[PDB]
Amino acid sequence: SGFRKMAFPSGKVEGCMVQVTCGTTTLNGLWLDDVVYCPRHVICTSEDMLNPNYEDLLIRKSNHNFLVQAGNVQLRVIGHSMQNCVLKLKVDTANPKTPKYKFVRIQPGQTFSVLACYNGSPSGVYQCAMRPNFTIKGSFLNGSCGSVGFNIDYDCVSFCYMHHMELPTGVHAGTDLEGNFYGPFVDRQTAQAAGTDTTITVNVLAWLYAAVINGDRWFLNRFTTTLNDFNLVAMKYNYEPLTQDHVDILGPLSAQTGIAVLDMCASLKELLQNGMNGRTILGSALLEDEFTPFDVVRQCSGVTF
Amino acid sequence: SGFRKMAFPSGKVEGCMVQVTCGTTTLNGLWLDDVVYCPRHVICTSEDMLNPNYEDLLIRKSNHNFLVQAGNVQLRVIGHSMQNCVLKLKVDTANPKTPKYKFVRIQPGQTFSVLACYNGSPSGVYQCAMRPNFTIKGSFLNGSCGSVGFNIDYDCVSFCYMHHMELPTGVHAGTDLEGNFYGPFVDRQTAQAAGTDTTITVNVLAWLYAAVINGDRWFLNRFTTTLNDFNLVAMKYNYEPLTQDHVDILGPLSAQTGIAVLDMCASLKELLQNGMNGRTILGSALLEDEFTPFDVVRQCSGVTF
Ligand SMILES: *CC(=O)[C@H](CCCNC(N)=O)NC(=O)[C@H](Cc1ccccc1)NC(=O)[C@@H](Cc1ccccc1)NC(=O)CCOCC#C
Ligand SMILES: *CC(=O)[C@H](CCCNC(N)=O)NC(=O)[C@H](Cc1ccccc1)NC(=O)[C@@H](Cc1ccccc1)NC(=O)CCOCC#C
């Protein structure tokens, strides 16, 4: 019983965090086997970001220009290259704490845990959703670049995010570990701002199920609706349209609660139309959309096994 | 920028989690040096919980009745004793991973991180506050007993909580690491009820400051109030009274924003009387009270350093 915004245990990623310094510029790197990965704008100064020529700035530095430091031991760089917006430093020692890992690209609507770091030292861990507009509402301070997002499944860490930037609204942007940004953002000092966002409908439904498993049932009605009927109200409240694939994904929770998906959509329809009657759902006065159907199962389906 | 419920990194506590089995009863233990700490009702069956005499139950147990598993490695028990409501199992081998640590008893109003575990295996990490009525609002499924709560400062882990039970209301109760329960609860299957919970007034104020730093200001006003007059309004809505100690603790935040504590108080008494009316603060449509002033300072106060 109980449902909280829960991050994955962070031990496996902590032992991979290092500090990268190139000149007066420092940030965080991820040390996996004999390579350190980090945002390429560590090779820049403040003035370089007016118009950075990364191909050129890279050729001009050599291995000795990079100081990598894991805890206090200096790691010796013996190679450097660039893949998209990520820098890769080969080092002479392989990380003995390297977990089983994969590089994945997450989709909008999906969640991950962020391990926020400064000067190579983890400071906090929390859970984020990739917004429909390819930003994340993180908590980051100066020097957090290179902090990573991940999921764990079995004993395998899937790295999906590396932190590069804060945009004007104070939301955050970054890349996958291949160095491709999520969203239409770039590592240069030029005008950028997050586009229009929408509410993640399948996640709002998963969260209402979590409530029910935990005994919150006031919002339930006896009503039901059609997928088409539901998607007309969804549009009126900036909710993205519900697909049959999303209905399938909700299978496990509908099974556990005995409430069919289109039944829970009728409940959600009434909440959007008539409000939350000054009541709370799992401790929130707002409809929450940063929990995936899998995030509910992980924390809630244990009673069913 | 940004503001997010943020746990401490869990790696140092992960390395201390074990599984403790007595007969057909299993739960989690904490392995520091050559002692495993766990809830004493691991030595009970469900039938013993109706009316347990823990001192007698423990006499009938030999060292071999305790099966401690650290991953897949069995640790042989060399001794068993009881301290208040925790069992201490002496084992033949010191945990090589034991961090610098301390046992502390925390105050109601304060926060800590919970590493939720099952069968000695960490599952997730989230942030909690000890409520005024000495309960915590967690996520604790079957087999979660013995999970711990902690804070980390420097390289030192301060353990403050061990989970023992869920109350019939769905909230959670346990002990410090000397085995003394927080609150008037007991490890026996009887009727016990948490007192009426109140809102943690100093925390709500600290959060309002974080909202201002973050750019939310629709709720600020030019009117002021007195600590006595604020507290009369506060009594009528189950808000705990605000003291001069609390005003001081909010000093660093008040300075950052240059907004006096008593002006924020006037804002709060305004939100308390009428309400918000469709508007939000840091993404929430409720007044949040699970962030301490320090919590806020450590995510938001980097700007001034
Ligand atoms: C994230 C991090 O730790 C590093 C610091 C660089 C190294 N510094 C030192 N002292 O060693 N990165 C940053 O601080 C980023 C770098 C950057 C610059 C340009 C594009 C992309 C990334 N700076 C920001 O994220 C900054 C980005 C930005 C600049 C101009 C216009 C739009 C975005 N965001 C902020 O500075 C917070 C203010 O928001 C921007 C506005 C308005
Ligand atoms: C927390 C945990 O993992 C272990 C399970 C031990 C058994 N493991 C085996 N066989 O492998 N501990 C528990 O579940 C606790 C034990 C307990 C019992 C009595 C007092 C204190 C602790 N059980 C609970 O926390 C339970 C206690 C309780 C029972 C009846 C009335 C009031 C409290 N709470 C709940 O089960 C949640 C709902 O219970 C009330 C209802 C309905």
mmCIF file of N, CA and C in Angstrom, chain B residues 63-120:
data_model
loop_
_atom_site.group_PDB
_atom_site.id
_atom_site.type_symbol
_atom_site.label_atom_id
_atom_site.label_comp_id
_atom_site.label_asym_id
_atom_site.label_seq_id
_atom_site.Cartn_x
_atom_site.Cartn_y
_atom_site.Cartn_z
ATOM 1 N N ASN B 63 21.024 -19.976 16.850
ATOM 2 C CA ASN B 63 21.679 -19.226 15.770
ATOM 3 C C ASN B 63 21.330 -19.796 14.393
ATOM 4 N N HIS B 64 21.204 -21.123 14.293
ATOM 5 C CA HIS B 64 20.952 -21.759 12.999
ATOM 6 C C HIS B 64 19.541 -21.507 12.483
ATOM 7 N N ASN B 65 18.613 -21.094 13.341
ATOM 8 C CA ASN B 65 17.273 -20.755 12.876
ATOM 9 C C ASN B 65 17.261 -19.488 12.014
ATOM 10 N N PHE B 66 18.359 -18.722 11.956
ATOM 11 C CA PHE B 66 18.406 -17.468 11.194
ATOM 12 C C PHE B 66 19.224 -17.646 9.917
ATOM 13 N N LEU B 67 18.584 -17.400 8.783
ATOM 14 C CA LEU B 67 19.213 -17.533 7.471
ATOM 15 C C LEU B 67 19.320 -16.123 6.886
ATOM 16 N N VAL B 68 20.539 -15.578 6.896
ATOM 17 C CA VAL B 68 20.874 -14.262 6.352
ATOM 18 C C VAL B 68 21.549 -14.447 4.989
ATOM 19 N N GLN B 69 20.967 -13.849 3.943
ATOM 20 C CA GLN B 69 21.472 -13.916 2.572
ATOM 21 C C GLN B 69 21.840 -12.522 2.082
ATOM 22 N N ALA B 70 23.116 -12.330 1.771
ATOM 23 C CA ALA B 70 23.624 -11.091 1.190
ATOM 24 C C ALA B 70 23.833 -11.368 -0.297
ATOM 25 N N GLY B 71 22.827 -11.019 -1.103
ATOM 26 C CA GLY B 71 22.760 -11.414 -2.497
ATOM 27 C C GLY B 71 22.386 -12.877 -2.632
ATOM 28 N N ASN B 72 23.368 -13.705 -2.977
ATOM 29 C CA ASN B 72 23.214 -15.152 -2.904
ATOM 30 C C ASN B 72 24.183 -15.779 -1.907
ATOM 31 N N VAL B 73 24.902 -14.973 -1.120
ATOM 32 C CA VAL B 73 25.930 -15.465 -0.208
ATOM 33 C C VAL B 73 25.334 -15.579 1.192
ATOM 34 N N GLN B 74 25.374 -16.777 1.753
ATOM 35 C CA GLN B 74 24.901 -16.975 3.110
ATOM 36 C C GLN B 74 25.922 -16.434 4.103
ATOM 37 N N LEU B 75 25.432 -15.717 5.119
ATOM 38 C CA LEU B 75 26.258 -15.218 6.214
ATOM 39 C C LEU B 75 25.860 -15.962 7.484
ATOM 40 N N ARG B 76 26.805 -16.674 8.090
ATOM 41 C CA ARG B 76 26.472 -17.509 9.234
ATOM 42 C C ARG B 76 26.234 -16.645 10.468
ATOM 43 N N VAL B 77 25.133 -16.898 11.156
ATOM 44 C CA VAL B 77 24.802 -16.172 12.378
ATOM 45 C C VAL B 77 25.603 -16.737 13.549
ATOM 46 N N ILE B 78 26.234 -15.836 14.311
ATOM 47 C CA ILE B 78 27.067 -16.156 15.466
ATOM 48 C C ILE B 78 26.444 -15.696 16.779
ATOM 49 N N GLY B 79 25.263 -15.090 16.742
ATOM 50 C CA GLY B 79 24.649 -14.538 17.944
ATOM 51 C C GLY B 79 23.389 -13.786 17.573
ATOM 52 N N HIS B 80 22.465 -13.741 18.533
ATOM 53 C CA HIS B 80 21.205 -13.029 18.372
ATOM 54 C C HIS B 80 20.878 -12.339 19.688
ATOM 55 N N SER B 81 20.580 -11.042 19.645
ATOM 56 C CA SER B 81 20.056 -10.346 20.816
ATOM 57 C C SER B 81 18.970 -9.392 20.354
ATOM 58 N N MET B 82 18.290 -8.786 21.314
ATOM 59 C CA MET B 82 17.161 -7.918 21.026
ATOM 60 C C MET B 82 17.468 -6.568 21.650
ATOM 61 N N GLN B 83 17.233 -5.478 20.915
ATOM 62 C CA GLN B 83 17.276 -4.148 21.518
ATOM 63 C C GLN B 83 15.960 -3.431 21.247
ATOM 64 N N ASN B 84 15.167 -3.225 22.298
ATOM 65 C CA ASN B 84 13.815 -2.716 22.106
ATOM 66 C C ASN B 84 13.120 -3.542 21.031
ATOM 67 N N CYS B 85 12.770 -2.955 19.864
ATOM 68 C CA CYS B 85 12.008 -3.678 18.848
ATOM 69 C C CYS B 85 12.862 -4.126 17.655
ATOM 70 N N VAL B 86 14.182 -3.970 17.705
ATOM 71 C CA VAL B 86 15.065 -4.470 16.658
ATOM 72 C C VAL B 86 15.830 -5.687 17.166
ATOM 73 N N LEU B 87 16.026 -6.634 16.269
ATOM 74 C CA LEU B 87 16.887 -7.782 16.470
ATOM 75 C C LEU B 87 18.266 -7.483 15.911
ATOM 76 N N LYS B 88 19.299 -7.857 16.661
ATOM 77 C CA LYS B 88 20.682 -7.706 16.220
ATOM 78 C C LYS B 88 21.300 -9.086 16.018
ATOM 79 N N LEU B 89 21.635 -9.411 14.775
ATOM 80 C CA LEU B 89 22.220 -10.706 14.438
ATOM 81 C C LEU B 89 23.722 -10.520 14.214
ATOM 82 N N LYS B 90 24.536 -11.053 15.138
ATOM 83 C CA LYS B 90 25.993 -11.087 14.951
ATOM 84 C C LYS B 90 26.387 -12.133 13.920
ATOM 85 N N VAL B 91 27.186 -11.720 12.935
ATOM 86 C CA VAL B 91 27.603 -12.631 11.884
ATOM 87 C C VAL B 91 29.128 -12.684 11.857
ATOM 88 N N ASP B 92 29.652 -13.697 11.169
ATOM 89 C CA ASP B 92 31.083 -14.003 11.207
ATOM 90 C C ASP B 92 31.939 -13.080 10.340
ATOM 91 N N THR B 93 31.342 -12.162 9.582
ATOM 92 C CA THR B 93 32.089 -11.394 8.587
ATOM 93 C C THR B 93 31.605 -9.953 8.571
ATOM 94 N N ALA B 94 32.549 -9.016 8.597
ATOM 95 C CA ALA B 94 32.200 -7.610 8.521
ATOM 96 C C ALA B 94 31.890 -7.234 7.075
ATOM 97 N N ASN B 95 30.867 -6.410 6.892
ATOM 98 C CA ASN B 95 30.490 -5.957 5.554
ATOM 99 C C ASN B 95 31.616 -5.098 4.988
ATOM 100 N N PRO B 96 32.314 -5.514 3.924
ATOM 101 C CA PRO B 96 33.385 -4.648 3.404
ATOM 102 C C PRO B 96 32.856 -3.331 2.878
ATOM 103 N N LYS B 97 31.560 -3.257 2.594
ATOM 104 C CA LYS B 97 30.933 -2.079 2.027
ATOM 105 C C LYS B 97 30.343 -1.115 3.049
ATOM 106 N N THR B 98 30.487 -1.380 4.353
ATOM 107 C CA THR B 98 29.946 -0.490 5.380
ATOM 108 C C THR B 98 30.438 0.948 5.201
ATOM 109 N N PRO B 99 29.554 1.921 4.985
ATOM 110 C CA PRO B 99 29.981 3.318 4.899
ATOM 111 C C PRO B 99 30.165 3.936 6.286
ATOM 112 N N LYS B 100 30.696 5.157 6.292
ATOM 113 C CA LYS B 100 30.599 5.981 7.489
ATOM 114 C C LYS B 100 29.128 6.246 7.781
ATOM 115 N N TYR B 101 28.689 5.974 9.021
ATOM 116 C CA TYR B 101 27.267 6.066 9.331
ATOM 117 C C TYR B 101 27.053 6.484 10.794
ATOM 118 N N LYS B 102 25.818 6.901 11.098
ATOM 119 C CA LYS B 102 25.377 7.189 12.472
ATOM 120 C C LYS B 102 23.907 6.814 12.611
ATOM 121 N N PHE B 103 23.473 6.513 13.854
ATOM 122 C CA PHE B 103 22.055 6.345 14.152
ATOM 123 C C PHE B 103 21.523 7.628 14.777
ATOM 124 N N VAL B 104 20.456 8.193 14.193
ATOM 125 C CA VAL B 104 19.844 9.413 14.714
ATOM 126 C C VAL B 104 18.338 9.243 14.821
ATOM 127 N N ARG B 105 17.751 9.946 15.787
ATOM 128 C CA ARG B 105 16.299 10.008 15.942
ATOM 129 C C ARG B 105 15.821 11.353 15.403
ATOM 130 N N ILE B 106 14.916 11.338 14.442
ATOM 131 C CA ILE B 106 14.578 12.575 13.753
ATOM 132 C C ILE B 106 13.341 13.192 14.381
ATOM 133 N N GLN B 107 13.118 14.504 14.071
ATOM 134 C CA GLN B 107 11.981 15.245 14.607
ATOM 135 C C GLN B 107 10.784 15.108 13.667
ATOM 136 N N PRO B 108 9.550 15.115 14.177
ATOM 137 C CA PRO B 108 8.411 15.322 13.272
ATOM 138 C C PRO B 108 8.586 16.637 12.523
ATOM 139 N N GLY B 109 8.220 16.624 11.240
ATOM 140 C CA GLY B 109 8.463 17.739 10.374
ATOM 141 C C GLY B 109 9.645 17.537 9.441
ATOM 142 N N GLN B 110 10.561 16.632 9.780
ATOM 143 C CA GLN B 110 11.752 16.470 8.968
ATOM 144 C C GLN B 110 11.574 15.377 7.920
ATOM 145 N N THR B 111 12.444 15.417 6.907
ATOM 146 C CA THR B 111 12.370 14.505 5.776
ATOM 147 C C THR B 111 13.552 13.559 5.769
ATOM 148 N N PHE B 112 13.349 12.437 5.101
ATOM 149 C CA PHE B 112 14.435 11.507 4.872
ATOM 150 C C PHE B 112 14.141 10.751 3.589
ATOM 151 N N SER B 113 15.139 9.988 3.125
ATOM 152 C CA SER B 113 14.982 9.142 1.945
ATOM 153 C C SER B 113 14.684 7.717 2.394
ATOM 154 N N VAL B 114 13.772 7.058 1.696
ATOM 155 C CA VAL B 114 13.459 5.651 1.913
ATOM 156 C C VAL B 114 13.968 4.836 0.716
ATOM 157 N N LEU B 115 14.753 3.781 1.004
ATOM 158 C CA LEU B 115 15.143 2.770 0.004
ATOM 159 C C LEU B 115 14.244 1.558 0.209
ATOM 160 N N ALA B 116 13.198 1.457 -0.603
ATOM 161 C CA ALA B 116 12.272 0.342 -0.460
ATOM 162 C C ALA B 116 12.911 -0.948 -0.984
ATOM 163 N N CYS B 117 12.852 -2.020 -0.183
ATOM 164 C CA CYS B 117 13.464 -3.296 -0.533
ATOM 165 C C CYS B 117 12.496 -4.459 -0.333
ATOM 166 N N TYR B 118 12.763 -5.539 -1.077
ATOM 167 C CA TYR B 118 12.086 -6.823 -0.917
ATOM 168 C C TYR B 118 13.099 -7.944 -1.102
ATOM 169 N N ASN B 119 13.088 -8.906 -0.170
ATOM 170 C CA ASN B 119 13.990 -10.062 -0.184
ATOM 171 C C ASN B 119 15.450 -9.627 -0.231
ATOM 172 N N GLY B 120 15.795 -8.574 0.519
ATOM 173 C CA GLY B 120 17.150 -8.043 0.466
ATOM 174 C C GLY B 120 17.513 -7.301 -0.810
#
